[PDB]
Design a protein around this ligand. Structure first.
Ligand code: 6ZQ
Lengths: 35, 336, 100, 44, 50
């Protein structure tokens, strides 16, 4: 009987693409303040 | 029992039957307890009968009224009456589905680590909308959170929208899995399906009519059960009937016991009402009233037993000491 | 109430699940294993009866046949024979009802 | 008019916790609907 | 069905049968195995003729 449950090791795959977008969001914010 | 004396000393099914037998024949009886027990068996070496059946062949008693198995070895030495109570080998397991509701299960599929990890991403995006654009910016970032998600702020809501989309889908997807897997359950399966899996163990009594049934049985379903229990380690057998009842209660629903339907139905109706008979009987057998051969009581007693079955008496006496006087009277009608 | 046992079975098949019938378990179990496999035995039996082999009184064949029947039960013959003509010979298999 | 499209600072936490509540039901509505379309049980 | 002989015996949607006169048919007949005897009883009484 599963009881397959949810894997935190695979949920992190989208937590890394999000913070990657947050890091890209800080790079585009600075070029808007200069021009 | 100390203050009284005579036939009133004892009470039970056969006790009530003893009178109903005597009423349709007319004889002054006396309820004697067998001095040794063991119903009725024959020794291998000496070949001397013992128990209730023996006290009929040797003339020490005049009739044997009890839950006496109608076997061939006993029919050769005593005249049995027709069955007053049909029965068979059955199954006994614990009461399933004992758990579990509550708000602690409200955070189960998404594991304990993810409900505390989703909150790190919410405040991490409500603090970036603080920068790309304290009381109205958190209200503006929360106003963008409920509705999904400058060039700097558009890619924040674009990437957050992907992230929140994945979690609600992996949440809904896994939530169907625990409901599809729940929708299998046995629950409550038949005697053949008990043999197919080896997660829940099963066994019988170590020395009795129940074990020998599986021994020389040439049926595939029952031979497969026999070859399993014979090689089963640790030992699935038990010494006495009291142990087999107790072992099912303390196995967390991971052990079963096989026994006659009469003794199975009776434990279902006694505290703490955690046992249950499941499935149908395995073989055909019944109890009978034994008499000495050639005795004048014979055919009249046999005729009387047929009279009690068709008038609805033996069905009523069955219900009386099982269900009516039973301590789990409420656990029978509403158990399904 | 119906006239024959034949009308009792057919009436259940045309009642759209709003009529039941009561009969001996043997016949009911057998009908359960015959096409088009739409009937079913539910719940336990209501009373304790059985079938027997009848012999004229005082006949020589009396005592032996009675003893012989007890030998068949304890040799798993009667259970096998019933399993052979009810379920084995049946058209709706016993495994057909166990998730197929 | 704020209920159909999901869900000031006092009116934002109202539309946020409501959005979280209705998200659970619509998901638990869909997840259970799939389970009863996969395994058909027969009620006696 | 999964590739196995016991999985073929456990269901009766997809039917099965052998040759009318050959060693193939006689094997199932006198076989005293649990898996094969069930296949024999089915083919012996399957209607119409498999
Ligand atoms: C019923 C026996 N359960 C074992 C405790 C099986 C099981 C195991 C793991 C997970 C579950 C479903 C748990 C569950 N998680 C939720 C997560 C978020 C949310 F908003 C709601 C739920 C939720 O209602 N459940 C739940 C709990 C009990 C019964 C039904 C459900 Cl859907 N059930």
């Amino acid at each position: 009987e599963k009881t397959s449950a949810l894997s935190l090791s695979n949920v992190a795959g989208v937590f890394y693409i999000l913070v990657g977008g947050l890091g890209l969001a800080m790079l585009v914010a600075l070029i808007e303040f200069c021009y | 029992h100390e203050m009284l004396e005579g036939n009133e000393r004892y009470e039970g099914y056969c006790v009530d039957l003893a009178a109903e037998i005597a009423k349709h024949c007319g004889f002054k009886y006396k309820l004697t307890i067998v001095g040794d027990g063991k119903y009725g068996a024959r020794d291998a070496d000496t070949k001397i009968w013992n128990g209730m059946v023996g006290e009929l062949v040797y003339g020490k008693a005049d009739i044997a009224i009890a839950p006496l198995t109608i076997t061939l070895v006993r029919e050769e030495v005593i005249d049995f009456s027709k069955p007053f109570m049909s029965l068979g080998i059955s199954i006994m397991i614990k009461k399933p589905q004992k758990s579990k509701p509550g708000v602690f299960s409200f955070l189960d599929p998404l594991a304990y680590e993810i409900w505390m990890c989703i909150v790190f991403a919410y405040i991490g995006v409500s603090v970036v909308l603080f920068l790309v654009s304290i009381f109205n910016s958190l209200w503006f970032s929360l106003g963008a959170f409920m509705q999904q998600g400058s060039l700097s702020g558009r890619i924040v809501g674009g990437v957050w929208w992907f992230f929140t989309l994945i979690i609600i889908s992996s949440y809904t997807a896994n939530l169907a899995a625990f409901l599809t897997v729940e929708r299998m359950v046995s629950p409550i399966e038949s005697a053949e399906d008990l043999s197919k899996q080896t997660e829940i163990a099963y066994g019988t009594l170590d020395s009795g009519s129940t074990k020998e049934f599986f021994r020389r049985s040439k049926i595939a379903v029952f031979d497969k059960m026999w070859t399993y229990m014979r090689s089963a380690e640790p030992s699935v057998f038990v010494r006495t009937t009291a142990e087999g009842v107790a072992r099912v209660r303390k196995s967390k629903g991971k052990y079963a016991y096989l026994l006659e339907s009469t003794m199975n139905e009776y434990i279902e109706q006694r505290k703490p009402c955690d046992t249950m008979k499941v499935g149908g009987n395995l073989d055909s057998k019944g109890y009978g009233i034994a008499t000495p051969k050639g005795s004048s009581l014979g055919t009249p007693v046999n005729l009387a037993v047929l009279k009690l079955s068709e008038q609805g008496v033996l069905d009523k006496l069955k219900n009386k000491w099982w269900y009516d006087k039973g301590e789990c009277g409420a656990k029978d009608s509403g158990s399904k």
